Design a protein around this nucleic acid. Structure first.
Lengths: 213, 63, 94, 125, 230, 11, 63, 51, 290
RNA sequence: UUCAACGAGGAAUUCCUAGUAAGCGCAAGUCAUCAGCUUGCGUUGAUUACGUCCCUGCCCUUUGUACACAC
């Protein structure tokens, strides 16, 4: 048929480079394990806000996303998960610890549910983000709520927030750690099991909006 | 902004209002540029939905 | 662009060298008999080769794919690419 | 006597000087190889100037990087910046300009902070 | 064909708190309780309708609204109900001054009134009360709003007199296997039953008669016991 | 206190 | 319950909305000509899609 | 459910401290607070009349 | 190349090149009973005497991955599926086995009941992945199609003695040991076809080897509470070919799997409280240019 | 064995928008101030607004003037 030759000598270097590292020059995988192609966002209106189309090697892109309004809609969603994981007074700044426990939770997500953990966390985002909410229409403070819709950036924000703080309180004083509780949370949120803090909170917010619609 | 806030059902009854008001030719001629400005902004802003409505009543109304 | 030179050998293989530094960049292997015509777009985007087995191959150039292949009814002896109108003429054997 | 090229990579207070010259293909950061650059979770931040363009660009040149200052992550960002713009400058000066701006296009499509830092800050609102 | 449990010796039920937002339970919220303290010069008291002529009128308020006796006799009824012994209930109260108190199931509220008054003074000023056996902390002032502490799947209803009357047994077996039930009952002497409009999606009632507070609590508890087979 | 737009809508 | 998707075509300005809530004008995707005025909670801009649990309800102001 | 009895003091007063059952540690805490306030007042007064 | 030995209240992974304990799992509360590796060899399930299946990952004893709380009775056998990866079959002293999806580890995805006394063994059929053969102390190897209800076996094989183990040799034939013999059963025809009773006391366990470097193309070895472990050749009518005698009653045995590629092992753990391993092992550039 | 406090702190309240909040240590001790501490210096580094006058306030204008066109 037709084939292109574009290297003309088997490439060998003087510094020995590991075989999986030099295998990573044909496709960029997260932590050299998890592929970014065939990772779709199975809910439209959240594609163009959960970003999985520039593959990365680690969740530590030091780029600047907090100086325009919707610029954090194209931080990769693994890194948005990581950044939302490193928040409380105890664990502020510790992005390498957050990256390391994201690596551990994607390994154990894959070893429990034998599928792509990036696809699992993307399904967890698109199942967790609430599609309706209530504002408090004031009237000076008349305690009545009015149901509003909710924009997709707010849905991705509140999805990552619900998932991460659900993993924190689920790891609060049990035997499991943050990596294992976050793995359980992301798996249950991906399949949508109503056993997770995150989609129970989504179902409560959507049900209250349905109530005082 | 007042003409952009209102939805298309209120745009259709605004067209009914203009259709009735240009039969009384007294207050048509005393408010011609106001009627022209409001009506042309309304259908220029709502043009995509207006040309997808299918009703001969509104077609005869526009004519 | 002046960057690329294209060699078409009698064993049917186009090699693309860089004119500045003189080294092999790419090597397409479509034909099996002698490649008698190579040309490229004015925008370095699609190249066109013709061999004397009577197939005109159309390749993308930036991506290294082929866009298509068209089998004529005679071995082709010469190509001339008019580059502004993107029309090339072949002197066939018939 | 040798064709050689020197570039600089900077983040906050780390700074990395990379000398690129023609050779056999060895990439050495602070004397040790590139496969020893700790904190070992950002070793792929150091690797991505190699894996973005292929090791066949590095098969004929040897790089050495000297990194001072900074912390762990500022040093890996200085290393990757120095390696990237050193490969670009070597292919500019001693290989062809078409491979030069192909390398610039690949690094700039990944992130242009491999080639241009974000340097002077803040903003007084 | 089905075997026994491996251990027939009866364990005590796991006492539930706000640190367990998973288990199905019954929350009872005593709203608009009258729990305020005051100085005498030398002495601190809890404001009654009877410890004063006009301390409440010097504070501005009226004497009919200083009734801690009725939240006392609701708390006694809820914590002597069998559902509390079975461990399917916890009691939150919220003062009319906006102070939320979490009440453990394991507490022994004192039976006479002024013992409860002296308990409420130290609870309101030390924000915490330990046991005599001092191993856990079993009556404590916690942070508003109550929805931070209620379980994540929890239908929140309120109790009144002017509402579509239901039956507690079929109403509780309507809800599903992990949903709890948070019942805001008003511990006023009188007042509009709108004390929890911002938390509640269903306002129901239990009788066609003017129902007292602890009688409403005991009615809902006995209905819950019949619905959960206790 | 309404504003333009909703005054015109109710009218 | 069948849900529907609706793309923003215009963020309505100078409406007297309550803060943190912005009115918006969305057209549908199954018939991309008819619009409806909704009012959303988070940050919204043009040509982004948002999810309507119902579409039988026009939005008033909030205030 | 087990049923514990609540520990609390009778005739509670927040402004008075708790009644410690030791008269030689409550006494040293009382007189530590006493020397702290009297030392602070004393040296405040002597530095302001020095001023 | 590694094997896990379940003693009381710890599980030790030994290496197949040094035969020392590389890693050990000691954080069980009661006697740990079963410990098996997943078919990918990535994680390790252990059933415990309190009915708490705990699955760690192998080669990391500190990360307990999930603790399935099975029956209140002791859980005596825990093994993953051999075809599927994300289902784990645990039978217990509750006379009911359970299939658990390890994602949803709260309720069992299937509850295989039907046996009257003390189910002590599972097995999976090696080509049809819907087919679970379970064995209990009343005889009566039940076996279940998991697409059906699952509370009734499709058929039952009457080993007359209380079975101790059931393994699957072919996709068709399975071998059950219990009592002084073992029997083999064709599974497409529901029918016994060999029985060897060459022991004195009860055969405690079996396992099976295929395609390994051997004159024997297949080998079933059997461990039998009197000291003996014997190897039977499935191709000439399950005739015994070799045996070892040990210093006490042998409670469990295993061999290195079919693709061992190195130092090959036969291990037998005794009821005396000790473990017996028998292994078989395996100038100038100028001058060169001249 | 059994007689004080305490397991992340109520009501309220204050501050805060990118190398920012927060974590971390290391130095200095600069005529006032500070060592019951103060000021530097680097290391790690986010979440959420970036819209709106609906609430609370503060401010400005009410001839368009300044030259066309337009309103």
């Amino acid at each position: 048929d037709f084939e292109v030759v574009e290297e003309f000598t088997p490439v060998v270097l003087a510094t020995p480079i590991p075989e999986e590292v030099q295998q990573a020059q044909t496709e960029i995988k997260l932590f050299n394990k998890w592929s970014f192609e065939e990772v779709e966002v199975k809910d439209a209106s959240l594609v163009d806000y959960v970003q999985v189309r520039q593959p990365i090697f680690v969740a530590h892109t030091a780029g600047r996303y907090a100086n325009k309004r919707f610029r954090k809609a194209q931080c990769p969603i693994i890194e948005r998960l990581t950044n939302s994981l490193m928040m409380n007074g105890r664990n502020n700044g510790k992005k390498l610890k957050a990256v390391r426990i994201i690596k551990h939770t994607l390994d154990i997500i894959n070893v429990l549910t034998d599928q792509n953990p990036i696809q699992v966390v993307v399904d967890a985002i698109t199942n967790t983000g609430p599609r309706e909410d209530t504002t408090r229409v004031g009237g000076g403070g008349a305690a009545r709520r009015q149901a509003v819709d909710v924009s997709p950036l707010r849905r991705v924000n509140q999805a990552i927030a619900l998932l991460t703080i659900g993993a924190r309180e689920a790891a609060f004083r049990n035997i499991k750690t943050i990596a294992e509780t976050l793995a359980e949370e992301l798996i249950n949120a991906a399949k949508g099991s109503s056993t997770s803090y995150a989609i129970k909170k989504k179902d409560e917010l959507e049900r209250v909006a349905k109530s005082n619609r | 902004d007042a003409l952009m806030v209102m939805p298309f059902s209120y745009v259709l009854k605004f067209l009914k209002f203009i259709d009735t008001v240009m039969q009384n030719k007294t207050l048509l001629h005393s408010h011609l540029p106001l009627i022209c400005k409001n009506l042309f902004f309304i259908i220029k802003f709502n043009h995509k939905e207006l040309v997808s409505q299918k009703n001969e009543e509104l077609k005869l109304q526009i004519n | 662009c002046g960057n690329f030179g294209f060699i078409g050998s009698s064993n049917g293989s186009i090699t693309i060298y860089n004119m500045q530094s003189g080294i092999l960049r790419k090597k397409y292997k479509l034909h099996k008999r002698a490649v008698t015509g190579i040309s490229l777009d004015g925008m370095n985007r699609k190249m066109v080769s013709c061999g004397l087995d009577g197939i005109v191959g159309f390749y993308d150039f930036n991506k290294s794919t082929l866009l298509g292949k068209l089998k004529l009814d005679a071995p082709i002896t010469a190509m001339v690419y008019h580059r502004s109108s993107d029309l090339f003429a072949l002197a066939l054997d018939d | 006597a040798v064709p050689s090229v020197q570039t600089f990579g900077k983040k906050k207070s780390a700074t990395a000087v990379a000398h690129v010259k023609a050779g056999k293909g060895l990439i050495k950061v602070n004397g040790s190889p590139i496969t020893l650059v700790e904190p070992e979770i950002l070793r792929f931040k150091v690797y991505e100037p190699l894996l973005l363009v292929g090791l066949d660009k590095f098969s004929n040149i040897d790089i050495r990087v000297r990194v001072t200052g900074g912390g762990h992550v500022s040093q890996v960002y200085a290393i990757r910046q120095a390696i990237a713009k050193g490969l670009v400058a070597y292919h500019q000066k001693y290989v062809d300009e078409q491979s030069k701006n192909e390398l610039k296009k690949a690094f700039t499509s990944y992130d242009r902070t491999l080639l241009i830092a974000d340097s002077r800050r803040p903003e007084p609102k | 064909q089905k075997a026994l449990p491996a251990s027939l010796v009866p364990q005590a039920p796991p006492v539930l708190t706000s640190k367990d937002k998973i288990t199905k339970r019954m929350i009872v919220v005593l709203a608009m309780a009258s729990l305020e303290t005051h100085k005498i010069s030398d002495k601190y008291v809890l404001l009654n309708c009877d410890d004063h002529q006009g301390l409440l009128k010097k504070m501005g308020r009226d004497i009919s609204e200083a009734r801690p006796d009725i939240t006392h006799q609701c708390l006694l009824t809820l914590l002597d109900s069998p559902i509390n012994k079975a461990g399917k209930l916890q009691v939150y109260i919220q003062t009319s001054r906006g102070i939320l108190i979490e009440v453990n199931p394991t507490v022994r509220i004192p039976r006479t009134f002024k013992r409860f008054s002296g308990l409420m003074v130290q609870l309101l000023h030390k924000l915490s009360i330990r046991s005599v056996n001092s191993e856990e902390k079993l009556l404590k002032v916690i942070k508003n709003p109550i929805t931070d502490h209620l379980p994540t799947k929890c239908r929140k209803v309120t109790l009144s007199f002017d509402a579509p009357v239901i039956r507690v047994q079929d109403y509780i077996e309507k809800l599903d296997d992990d949903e709890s039930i948070c019942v805001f009952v008003g511990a006023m002497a009188r007042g509009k039953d709108n004390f929890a409009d911002e938390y509640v999606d269903e306002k129901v009632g239990l009788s066609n008669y003017p129902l007292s507070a602890s009688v409403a609590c005991s009615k809902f508890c006995h209905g819950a016991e019949d619905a959960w087979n206790i | 206190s309404l504003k333009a737009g909703e005054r015109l809508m109710e009218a | 319950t069948p849900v529907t998707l609706a793309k923003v075509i215009k963020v309505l300005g100078r409406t007297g909305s309550r803060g943190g809530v912005t009115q918006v004008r969305v057209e549908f995707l199954e018939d991309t000509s008819r619009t409806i005025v909704r009012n959303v909670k988070g940050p919204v801009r043009e040509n982004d899609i948002l999810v309507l649990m119902e579409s039988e309800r026009e939005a008033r102001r909030l205030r | 459910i087990p049923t514990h009895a609540p520990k609390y003091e009778e005739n509670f007063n927040p402004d008075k401290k708790s009644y410690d059952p030791d008269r030689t540690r409550s006494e040293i805490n009382k007189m530590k607070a006493q020397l702290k306030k009297e030392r602070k007042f004393t040296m405040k007064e002597i530095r302001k009349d020095a001023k | 190349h590694d094997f896990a030995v379940t003693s009381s209240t710890r599980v030790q992974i030994f290496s197949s090149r040094t035969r020392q304990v590389i890693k050990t799992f000691s954080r069980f509360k009661d006697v740990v009973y079963s410990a098996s590796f997943r078919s990918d060899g990535k994680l390790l399930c252990a059933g415990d005497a309190t009915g708490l299946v705990s699955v760690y990952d192998s080669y990391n004893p500190r990360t307990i991955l999930l603790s399935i709380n099975a029956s209140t009775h002791p859980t005596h056998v825990t093994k993953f599926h051999t075809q599927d990866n994300k289902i784990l079959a645990t039978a217990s002293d509750d006379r009911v086995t359970r299939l658990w999806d390890i994602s949803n580890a709260y309720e069992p995805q299937l509850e295989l009941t039907g046996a009257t006394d003390y189910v002590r063994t599972l097995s999976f059929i090696p080509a049809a992945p819907h087919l679970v053969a379970t064995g209990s102390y009343d005889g009566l190897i039940r076996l279940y199609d998991t697409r059906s209800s699952g509370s009734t076996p499709i058929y039952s094989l009457n080993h007359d003695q209380p079975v101790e183990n059931v393994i699957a040799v072919s996709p068709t034939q399975i071998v059950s040991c219990g009592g002084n013999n073992f029997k083999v059963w064709d599974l497409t025809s529901n029918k016994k076809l060999y029985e060897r009773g060459n022991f004195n006391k009860a055969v405690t366990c079996l396992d099976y080897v295929e395609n390994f470097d051997s004159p024997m193309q297949s080998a079933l070895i059997a461990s039998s509470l009197d000291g003996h472990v014997k190897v039977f050749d499935p191709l000439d009518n399950f005739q015994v070919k070799f045996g070892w005698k040990f210093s006490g009653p042998v409670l469990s045995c295993a061999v290195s799997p079919s693709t061992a590629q190195g130092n090959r092992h036969l291990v037998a753990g005794l009821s005396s409280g000790l473990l017996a391993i028998r292994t078989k092992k395996k100038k100038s550039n100028n001058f060169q240019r001249m």
